[PDB]
Amino acid sequence: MDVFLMIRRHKTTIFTDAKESSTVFELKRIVEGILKRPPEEQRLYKDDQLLDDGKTLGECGFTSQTARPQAPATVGLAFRADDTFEALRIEPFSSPPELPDVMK
């Protein structure tokens, strides 16, 4: 069962996809391929909860019903800074303008 995701850190968002049976670790390998930071330098989060490398995305709560192509679920990403880890920070997107009058 395919799950569609946004891995988000700061003002970076990765659209990628995997299986309910894929592991958290496998996602870090994707991150590493794109952002050039090894797994041991990355933490992944669901909400504010740290995910273990060995759990499946399914076990973490990502079902294909919820992590959909047109509405992907979010995985948080934080990188190691020196010896400590940065705090998870995901910046929001911009706000649309107010709705046009003729659309109300």
């Binding site: 046009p100 009058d101 003729v102 659309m103």
Partner: protein
């Protein structure tokens, strides 16, 4: 003599229209002169058994907007004869519209045509807004495609 028309086989075919779409669906029966005739609406997620005929021609549109829908992954549905006591399924689904066409649909649903030109968009898009989905138009295209194959 229209290109696309129901053939008057007079041979019954039992069909199920299966609305696998979130749209309110309008079935259209192209009569023996190729004119579209509207049948009772199908609410999203519903199915209905219909007594149709071999060689009849059907197409399916959004009942509110006349946006085009697929039936068994194509544009037209033709009943064949039933075998083994089984109805023919007409599985009606959304196409994957272009993002453009999808945006056009949402805007048409929110804005009165008279008000299209108050929208702060490039002029070509006003034009596109106004070029509504048309059964007539689709029958023209489908007629030509049919002749080509």
């Amino acid at each position: 003599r229209p290109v696309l028309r129901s053939v008057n086989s007079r041979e019954p075919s039992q069909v199920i229209f299966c609305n696998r779409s979130p749209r309110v669906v309008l079935p259209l029966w192209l009569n023996f002169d190729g004119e579209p005739q509207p049948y009772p609406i199908l609410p999203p997620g519903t199915g209905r058994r219909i007594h149709s005929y071999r060689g009849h021609l059907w197409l399916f549109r959004d009942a509110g907007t006349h946006d085009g829908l697929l039936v068994n992954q194509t544009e037209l549905f033709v009943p064949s004869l039933n075998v083994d006591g089984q109805p023919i399924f007409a599985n009606i689904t959304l196409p994957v519209y272009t993002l453009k066409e999808r945006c056009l649909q949402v805007v048409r649903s929110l804005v009165k045509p008279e008000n299209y030109r108050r929208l702060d968009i490039v002029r070509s898009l006003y034009e596109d807004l106004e070029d509504y989905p048309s059964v007539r138009k689709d029958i023209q295209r489908l007629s030509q495609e049919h002749l080509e194959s």
